[PDB]
């Protein structure tokens, strides 16, 4: 689970502006935090198929959002994935 402080820090860091809470860039940043933590869990917990179910959802959610961003703008898309460290 994700703390409100880490959540709000993600919001502030990826916001387009101070009241943006839901742009696709903020959404993929939130999902990237979740995917990173859950990958570390599943590397240690291969039999946690319940948690693995969540990963496949989260990876798909981010895949759809990044594909949406990429055809709004490749400049914003490339900058965003570079910040998040996604190849």
């Amino acid at each position: 689970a994700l703390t409100q402080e880490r959540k709000q820090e993600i919001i502030v860091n990826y916001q387009v502006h101070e009241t943006d809470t839901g742009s696709a860039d903020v959404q993929v940043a939130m999902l990237t935090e979740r995917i990173n933590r859950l990958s570390l869990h599943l590397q240690a917990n291969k039999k946690d198929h319940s948690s693995r179910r969540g990963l496949l959802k989260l990876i798909g959610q981010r895949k759809r959002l990044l594909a949406y961003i990429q055809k709004d703008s490749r400049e914003k898309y490339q900058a965003l994935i570079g910040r998040l460290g996604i190849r």
Binding site: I35, N36, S39, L42, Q43, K46, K47, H49, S50, R52, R53, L55, L56, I59, G60, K63, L66, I81, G85, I86, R87
Partner: protein
């Protein structure tokens, strides 16, 4: 069916178990995986599928350069040989499956072409129905194997009248019929064949044998990829998911010892039977078995000692032990795998080799087969093969002095027919065939006797355990179980009851039905009905008769047939195959099954 398996736990100190586990998991199973990969890429692979046969030596040839590859080099000679046998039998299995499926697809595709309705047969013959009926009466009078003979007659007879007459004659089960064709029952029967062709076509897209990766390196690298990389499209992400859901293989492939003397038996000073394997004699394993099997493991030592006392003038061709499989059974709980899992030896024996009379049966079977071989076989190593065969043929004459038990004698005119059904798994009729009289019926309830309550237990547990799995799946709970072992128990109880009744009436044989593939018949029948009832509504079609289709997929007619065949062979009762009639009750089906198998003796 005189080959059976007996098993024992193998016990040894930890360093022996660890060394064997590492040989199996780190070298032998990776070698098997590599052989499966290379064999599936071989340029002759596509012609092996057409022959349905693997070359006798191609796995051995592929393994030779791998025996000194740093990935695989550390193994005894018999472990390489075991890996070869594993891989060779896998493809012998898989190529035989694909070959038969292809023949089924070709056979039914021809039938779909020659299945024409009388409205179509009128046009395609150019003759009135009475005219083709007469021509079918002539062609039947010549073809008098009848089915195959008509299928032979069809192909090269390009004369559309005779060709249509054969089509009409085959539509009716190789016979004349006066009655009119019900056009909707024909259209349904045509549709069944299309579904069967489609389902055969889909089954022929089987995967190549997948192997056992025990490291699961592909899973972890895919996890790192899918979490840090953008998927190029949906199909890459789907392939990632398909890998991430794939479950890890825990256990290596077992070892196979096709030379019975590669298991060397001994008794330790604490009096326990012990075994070691060729190439691993430093690892002594202690035999821990039930007394109900101990007499076999004692026999393995006595057979070994007999041939040593005779300075190898006996043949191991008559050793009661045939081969061994060395298996790790999955342990519950946690530990290092050589501690967690339990090492188990499975020995094939031929039950006839227990007695002296049965050994004489095997000796003649061996002698005839080897005398045939030596005559037909006639290089230096091929001449050495002849000399080994001639040594076997000489040495099988030396007796092991085994227990004498006179062979079963059954009356040729007394048969037991066993009717198999979805509702009543077995029903038997003892028939005196020259008298044409039933000596005894038994129902399923009389066969099970006091065990009959197990049959309601099975139905009740199959319902209950399916529903508990359904509930557990939604929670991702691992606690998913089923009644397969109870079902196996019931089929073995029935098999013993049937054979005991056969012995009691001195039946010469047990008659079993040629059911064919009941599941593909039922599945294509129900689909053809459902497509009429739910046109354009696939989920309605799949809901239709769902529980009947499930019941037919659970019907264990093969396991019951196999259990009967094994028990009859262990008492020397002949098994015969007959055709079960569709008419009548299970009792009448069993009687007419028995009597038809008697009349089919030619």
């Amino acid at each position: 069916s005189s080959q059976i398996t007996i098993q024992a736990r193998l016990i040894s100190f930890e360093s022996n178990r660890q060394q064997l586990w590492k040989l199996m998991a780190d070298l032998n199973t990776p070698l098997i995986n590599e052989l499966l990969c290379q064999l599936g890429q071989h340029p002759d692979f596509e012609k092996w599928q057409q022959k349905g046969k693997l070359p006798s030596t191609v796995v051995s040839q592929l393994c030779q350069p791998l025996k000194t590859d740093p990935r695989f080099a550390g193994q005894p000679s018999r472990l390489y040989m075991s890996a070869i046998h594993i891989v060779d039998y896998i493809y012998k299995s898989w190529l035989a499956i694909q070959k038969r499926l292809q023949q089924q697809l070709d056979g039914k595709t021809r039938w779909l072409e020659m299945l024409n309705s009388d409205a179509e047969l009128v046009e395609l013959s150019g003759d009135t129905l009475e005219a083709i009926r007469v021509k079918a009466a002539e062609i039947l009078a010549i073809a008098m194997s009848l089915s195959k003979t008509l299928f032979d007659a069809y192909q090269e007879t390009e004369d559309i009248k005779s060709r249509s007459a054969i089509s009409y004659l085959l539509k009716n089960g190789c016979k004349l019929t006066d009655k009119e064709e019900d056009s909707e029952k024909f259209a349904k029967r045509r549709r069944q064949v299309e579904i069967q062709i489609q389902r055969l076509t889909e089954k022929l897209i089987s995967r190549m044998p997948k192997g056992r990766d025990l490291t699961n390196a592909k899973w972890l690298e895919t996890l790192l990829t899918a979490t840090t990389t953008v998927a190029e499209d949906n199909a890459q992400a789907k392939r990632w998911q398909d890998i991430l859901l794939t479950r890890s293989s825990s256990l290596p492939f077992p070892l196979v010892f096709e030379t019975n003397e590669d298991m060397v038996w001994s008794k330790n000073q604490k009096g326990r039977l012990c075994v070691h394997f060729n190439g691993l004699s430093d690892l002594i394993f202690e035999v821990y078995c039930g007394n109900r099997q101990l007499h076999w493991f004692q026999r393995f030592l006595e057979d070994q000692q007999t041939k040593r006392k005779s300075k190898n003038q006996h043949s191991s061709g008559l050793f009661t032990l045939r081969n061994g499989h060395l298996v790790w059974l999955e342990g519950e709980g946690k530990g290092e795998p050589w501690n967690l899992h339990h090492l188990t030896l499975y020995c094939c024996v031929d039950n006839r080799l227990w007695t002296e009379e049965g050994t004489e049966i095997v000796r003649q079977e061996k002698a005839d087969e080897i005398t045939k071989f030596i005559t037909n076989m006639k290089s230096d190593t091929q001449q050495a093969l002849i000399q080994r065969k001639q040594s076997t043929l000489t040495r099988i004459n030396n007796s092991f002095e085994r227990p004498s038990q006179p062979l079963y004698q059954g009356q040729s005119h007394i048969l037991v027919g066993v009717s198999l059904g979805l509702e009543k798994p077995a029903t038997v009729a003892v028939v005196d065939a020259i008298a044409n009289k039933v000596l005894a019926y038994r129902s399923i309830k009389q066969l099970l006797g006091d065990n009959y309550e197990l049959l309601n237990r099975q139905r009740r547990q199959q319902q209950y355990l399916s529903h508990e799995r359904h509930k557990a799946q939604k929670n991702f709970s691992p606690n998913q179980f089923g009644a397969s072992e109870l079902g196996q128990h019931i089929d073995r109880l029935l098999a013993k009851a049937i054979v005991a009744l056969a012995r009691t009436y001195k039946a010469g044989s047990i008659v079993l039905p040629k059911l064919g593939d009941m599941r593909e018949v039922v599945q294509s029948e129900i689909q053809a009905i459902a497509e009429q009832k739910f046109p354009g509504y696939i989920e309605g079609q799949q809901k239709y008769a769902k529980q009947y289709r499930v019941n037919v997929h659970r019907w264990s007619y093969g396991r019951l047939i196999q259990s009967i065949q094994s028990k009859a062979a262990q008492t020397g009762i002949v098994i015969e195959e007959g055709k079960q009639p569709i008419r009548g009750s299970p009792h009448d089906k069993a009687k007419e099954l028995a009597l038809s198998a008697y009349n089919l003796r030619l």
